[PDB]
Amino acid sequence: GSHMGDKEKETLFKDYLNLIVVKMTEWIGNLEKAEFDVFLERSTPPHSDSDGLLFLDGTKTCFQMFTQQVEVAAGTNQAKILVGVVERFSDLLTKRQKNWISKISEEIKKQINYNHKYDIDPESITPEDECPGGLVEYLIAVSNDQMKAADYAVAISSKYGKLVSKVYEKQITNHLEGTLDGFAEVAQCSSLGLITLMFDDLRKPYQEIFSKTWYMGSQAQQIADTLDEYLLDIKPQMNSVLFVNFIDNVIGETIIKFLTALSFEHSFKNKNNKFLEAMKRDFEIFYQLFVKVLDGNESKDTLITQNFTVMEFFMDLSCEPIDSILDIWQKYLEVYWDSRIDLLVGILKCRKDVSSSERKKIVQQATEMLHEYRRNMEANGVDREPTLMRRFVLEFEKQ
Predict the structure, then answer these.
(1) Please, what is the angle between helix 240-260 and helix 180-200, to 10°?
(2) Residues 6+ apart with CB under 8 A from 28
(3) Would the CATH topology of 1-209 be identical to that of 210-399?
(4) CA dihedral in degrees (375, 344, 205, 267; nearest 10)?
(5) For this UniProt entry, which segments traverse the membrane?
(6) Rounded to whole angstroms, what are the CA distances from 115 to 53, 69, 108, 200, 303?
(7) What is the signed CA dihedral for 121, 193, 306, 378, rounded to 10 degrees?
(8) Which ranges constitute the DSSP H helices of the chain?
(9) According to CATH, what is the number of the domain 1-209?
(10) Phi/psi at 381 (nearest 5 deg)?
(11) DSSP 54
(12) Cα gap 395→106, rounded to integer Å
């Protein structure tokens, strides 16, 4: 080529980086559109990789395209151009995450509408409610892609980071690692949306828990069966690491949803331990369901225990003598340190052998044992991870 001055070479590098960068925002822009069309129309079902894991093309093209750009950028041997491309791609990924979360959230509001308005069919459904099928499988796809995407980011980082000076490697690393938490967030959005879908088919049975027909009903079994179907299909087509967090929230929702039924205030009828017996029955159905789903999984015992235990404290707080309620509550707190006082309030209100005034005194005390326990935890510098009960809520007016 011809001669070039340093000023003109720099200008060339700055103008080149810019053209590349602008093109990238355009590319991603178009991909997102095509990507959201597929996801929204679901006119076909997500593909499957060698390991049976579902996936979408969007994520795949996205990193194919970039792996192409980084090559050219690096071939340039100009760190500014390399980091510039890496930077742009990282900011575009983060924004992409923001958009997907928004899209995932709307499809689920849609579905949960295409359902309730299908509950009464076309008498109540306009072309606006029109919701294609296959969301479940798509939600799993989107979930698995986040994990893959997160791994691609890390690989790109360690690869291209070592090709530049320290100051520049640091930048590449922060840019790319800056996207990681966000992929997990998108995955959590889709994981939890799937759960919202699953439990939406269980509104009727859950609202009948503790009612007259529940003592000898089939509610828990209906729930187990509906969940069992989903999980049979889901477990195989989902990233193994995400499955643990997922099954943990499914088990956690099965119980939170169960205990919430304390809101109806049906008195516990325990003549001949029929309440207890009803509880042991339901407990066994759910217990067997997940012990089966978690077959072979190393987290099984932990997942079962951290979740099912509150069911046992619940049976006790509900049936044991009133004189032992607080000892049980203490032992309860030791496991669910982050628990509210709500569960006890609800339990006591269904207790035929506890008067209002007796409830107030028990709660006052119980509430005190709660703070005493946490306050005492700080003093001893005790740190523990959250439990299932951090989120159980049952609105009640202080007596």
Answers:
(1) 50
(2) 62, 92, 96
(3) yes
(4) 180
(5) none
(6) 27, 44, 11, 9, 31
(7) -130
(8) 6-41, 57-75, 79-116, 135-161, 166-177, 180-200, 203-206, 219-234, 240-260, 274-293, 300-319, 325-333, 342-350, 356-379
(9) 1.10.357.50
(10) 60, 45
(11) E
(12) 28
Closest CA to 319 of 286, 360, 341, 350: 350
Residue with tokens 């066994």: 284
Compute how many other C-beta atoms are within 10 angstroms of the C-beta atom of residue 392.
Answer: 20
CA 390 to chain centre: 15
For the chain, the residue count is: 399
Say which CATH superfamily domain 210-399 falls into. Exocyst complex component Sec6, C-terminal domain (1.10.357.70)
Cα–Cα distances (Å) from 252 to 136, 188, 238, in that order, read 19, 15, 19
Q: What's the CA gap between 20 and 17, in Å, rounded?
A: 5
> What are the sequence ranges of the domains in the chain?
1-209, 210-399
Q: Are 338 and 386 in contact (CB under 8 A)?
A: yes
Cα end-to-end span (Å), the chain: 87
Amino acid 367 reads: T
Write the single-letter amino acid at 337: W
Structure tokens at 186: 């998108």
